[PDB]
Ligand binder design. Structure first.
Ligand code: NAG
Ligand code: NAG
Ligand code: NAG
Ligand code: NAG
Ligand code: NAG
Ligand code: NAG
Ligand code: NAG
Ligand code: NAG
Ligand code: NAG
Ligand code: NAG
Ligand code: NAG
Ligand code: NAG
Lengths: 135, 135, 135
């Protein structure tokens, strides 16, 4: 990345801003902007690139061979009982939340067992989070 | 990436902004903008690129061979009982949520077992999250 | 990517904006904009690109061979009982949600077992999330 910007409200190169209930009288504004941008990003000069994978098996006895990749979830139990017994009561639940395994952003790249790779990998995440808002 | 921008409300190169209840009188605005952008991104010069995969098996005895890739979910149990017994009660549930395995963004790239790859991988995520809003 | 922009409300190169209840009198605006953009993106110069996959089996005995790719979901149980018994009660459920495995964005790319690939992979996601709004 080159230019990553997070701005809460207002982003401006030039901002002539006047707010409310304001007197803006007898103003002479002169502005000259000579802006130039030159970009040379991700230039590659490879005369020879070689990726080689070789597997050779000869008169071999293989048994009980197990290969497991990443992210192996096994024998997982969730138990969230919710028992509510009432007896001449006044129940007032305004905003009650029961969240189980809530995912917002899941970015996965090159999650493998055997990988051979060359170059650039980029991940960018921007957000403005707000889970619960009870007024 | 080159230019990634997040702006909450207002994005402007030049912003002459006047708000409410404002007096904007006798104004002389002169503006000159000479803006130039030059972009040279992702240029590749490869004279020779080779990817080679070779597998050779000779008089080999293979048994009980198991290969499992990523993201292996096995024997997963969710149990969320919800028992509500009432007896001359006044139930007032305004905004009650029961969320199980809620996914918003799931981006998956190159999730394999054996991978051979060359170049650029980019992932960009932008959002403005708001789960619960109870007024 | 080159130019990724998220703007909440207003995006403008030049914004002469006047809000409500405003007096905008005796104004002389002069604007000159000489804007030039030059783009050279994703240029590839390959004299020779080779991808080679070879499998050779000779007098080989293979047994009990198992290969499983990614995203293997097995023996998954969801149980969400909802028992509600009433006895001279006043039930007031305004906005009650029961969500199970809710997906919004699922982008999948190159989710394989054996992959051989060359170049550029890009994923872009933009959203403005709002799950629950109870007024
Ligand atoms: C604004 O400028 C004009 C011309 O120069 C002038 O006549 C006027 O008096 C100025 N305003 C005030 C409030 O003096
Ligand atoms: C920008 O404009 C002003 C306005 O008179 C001028 O004086 C200045 O020489 C200009 N600059 C360029 C680089 O054009
Ligand atoms: C890549 O191309 C040639 C070959 O190597 C080299 O002379 C040149 O300077 C390189 N380009 C850049 C932008 O570096
Ligand atoms: C390992 O080998 C034994 C006997 O050789 C067999 O009983 C067992 O099942 C094998 N393991 C697996 C995971 O298959
Ligand atoms: C605005 O400019 C004009 C012309 O220059 C001038 O006659 C007038 O008086 C100015 N406004 C005020 C409020 O002075
Ligand atoms: C921009 O415009 C102003 C207005 O007079 C001028 O003075 C300046 O020389 C200009 N600049 C260019 C680079 O054209
Ligand atoms: C790629 O093309 C030729 C061959 O390598 C080289 O001379 C040139 O400079 C390269 N181009 C860039 C933009 O680097
Ligand atoms: C492993 O081998 C044994 C006997 O050779 C067999 O009973 C068992 O089922 C094998 N494992 C699997 C996972 O098949
Ligand atoms: C606006 O400009 C005109 C012409 O220059 C001038 O006669 C007038 O008085 C100006 N307005 C005010 C409120 O002065
Ligand atoms: C832009 O327009 C203004 C208006 O007079 C002028 O002065 C300036 O020279 C112009 N610039 C270009 C680059 O054309
Ligand atoms: C690609 O074409 C030729 C052959 O390599 C080279 O001279 C040229 O500079 C390259 N083009 C770019 C835009 O790099
Ligand atoms: C593994 O081999 C044994 C005997 O050779 C067989 O009973 C079993 O079913 C095999 N495993 C699978 C998964 O088929």
């Amino acid at each position: 990345s080159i230019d990553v910007k997070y701005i809460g409200v207002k982003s401006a190169y030039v901002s002539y801003d006047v707010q409310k209930r304001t007197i803006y009288l007898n103003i002479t504004n002169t502005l000259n902007i000579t802006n130039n941008n030159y970009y040379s990003v991700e230039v590659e000069n490879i005369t020879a690139q070689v990726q080689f994978s070789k597997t050779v098996i000869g008169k071999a006895r293989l048994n009980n061979i197990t290969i497991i990749g990443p992210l192996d979830m096994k024998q997982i139990d969730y138990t969230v009982p919710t028992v509510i017994a009432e007896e001449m009561s006044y129940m007032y639940d305004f905003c009650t939340l029961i969240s189980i395994k809530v995912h917002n952003i899941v970015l996965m790249m090159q999650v493998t067992v055997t990988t051979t790779y060359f170059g650039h990998s980029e991940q960018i995440s921007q957000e403005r989070y707000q889970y619960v808002d009870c007024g």
